[PDB]
């Protein structure tokens, strides 16, 4: 995941289909390997004793001040507008710096994000629409106007900006604990049938 060339945007990210395997728990990030260190939903080390059905390698590029906003049930500038984690999210969110990888000459303006929306996003819901919608309590009614905010914004990924506006590549450990028959487990020894 971290050895890839580049990642996609926050709304049309390139995920990897992960099923019927055991993740590499031999060499991972525990003692603050990257900048972001956040886990939500369940106990942060209850991953090997539990099995997960649908695992997706959701990777997108955000700013420095938006790496802690990806959390289930937590508001933010990109959580309720771009990507909402489901209620059964059992993984963690951890990002590293990519200022010398995703930048270019003049700035990379190919990454965009939605800032405002009419309603909050559902659990496990995504949208790639770039049209103008209702910003907040006052709708724009088509074109941008009537004292409304502009939803569709662009990232200022420039190499001469501050550290808080640097591009950060994220990896979302989308371990979903559902009632479906699970496919991905941990490196543990299961018991027999009693």
């Amino acid at each position: 995941v971290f050895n890839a060339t580049r990642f996609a945007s926050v709304y049309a990210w390139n995920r990897k289909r992960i099923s019927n395997c055991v993740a590499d728990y031999s060499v991972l990030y525990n003692s603050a390997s990257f900048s972001t260190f956040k886990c939500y939903g369940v106990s942060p080390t209850k991953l090997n004793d539990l099995c997960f059905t649908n695992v997706y390698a959701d990777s997108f590029v955000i700013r420095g001040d938006e790496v802690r906003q990806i959390a289930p049930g937590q508001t933010g500038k990109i959580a309720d507008y771009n990507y909402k984690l489901p209620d059964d999210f059992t993984g963690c969110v951890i990002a590293w710096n990519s200022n010398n990888l995703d930048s270019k000459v003049g700035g990379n303006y190919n990454y965009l994000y939605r800032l405002f929306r009419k309603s909050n996003l559902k659990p496990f819901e995504r949208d790639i629409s770039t049209e103008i919608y209702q910003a907040g309590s006052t709708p724009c009614n088509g074109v941008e106007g009537f004292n409304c905010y502009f939803p569709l914004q662009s990232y200022g990924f420039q190499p001469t900006n501050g550290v808080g506006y640097q591009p950060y590549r994220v990896v979302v450990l989308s371990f979903e604990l559902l009632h479906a028959p699970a496919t991905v487990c941990g490196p543990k020894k299961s018991t027999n049938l009693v």
Partner: antibody, heavy 118, light 108 residues
């Protein structure tokens, strides 16, 4: 390799603190060099590192007041600590990442004492 | 921000017992646990790398293991010269951000 810490010991606040750690033994072609700060009171805060290819990372303890540069032809590493204060008075050290003989090694330098006051 | 949750800053022990220093982190690595050691008045030196070997000048009593949340530094037959600063770090991914810290003392 072996590092040697250096730099001015009298830096006024709200300025730029510069340091110099020279590499002796090999040029900057392979390996990694980091910068650490040793605070009194059983504390050791990590700042960051730089690589030979140009990629660098920063610790999340400082928001936007940490920058590390280097020079390949001079075999020296630099630390640029912006917005210094009286609480940043600590002991500086320089380390180097090295692998060999099926073991990991992290060599240390000499160390210097820098005092920041107005 | 890095949140290194620890029980106590100063841990009390005795000569001949087992030192229990646990870095209660909210993640897991596997078989790559690293520890540091800094004597008072000396330079910080490497103590534990790759959770199976030791550095030059390190005795055989310094070892580290653990799984999941609790990574416990194991020191068997701790002498009076083992009063040093211990920090939690890794050597898998960059940067190598350290931990909180733990200072030892002898309970009398």
């Amino acid at each position: 390799v072996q590092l040697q810490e250096s730099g001015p010991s009298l830096v006024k606040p709200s300025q730029t603190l510069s340091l110099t750690c020279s590499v002796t033994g090999d040029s900057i072609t392979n390996g990694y060099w980091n910068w650490i700060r040793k605070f009194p009171g059983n504390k050791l805060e990590y700042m960051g590192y730089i690589s030979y290819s140009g990629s660098t990372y920063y610790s999340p303890s400082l928001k936007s007041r940490i920058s590390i540069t280097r020079d390949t032809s001079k075999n020296q590493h630099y630390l640029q600590l912006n917005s210094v204060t009286s609480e940043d008075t600590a002991t500086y050290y320089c380390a180097s990442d090295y692998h060999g003989s099926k073991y990991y090694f992290d060599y240390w330098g000499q160390g210097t004492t820098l005092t920041v006051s107005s | 921000d890095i949140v290194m949750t620890q029980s106590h800053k100063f841990m009390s022990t005795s000569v001949g017992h087992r030192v229990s220093i646990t870095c209660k982190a909210s993640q897991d690595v596997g078989n790559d646990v690293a520890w540091y050691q800094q004597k008072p008045g000396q330079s910080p030196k490497l103590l534990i790398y790759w959770a199976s070997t030791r550095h030059t000048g390190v005795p055989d009593r310094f070892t580290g293991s653990g799984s999941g949340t609790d990574f416990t530094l194991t020191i068997s037959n701790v002498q009076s010269e083992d009063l040093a600063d211990y920090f939690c770090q890794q050597y898998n991914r960059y940067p190598y951000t350290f931990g909180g810290g733990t200072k030892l003392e002898i309970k009398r």
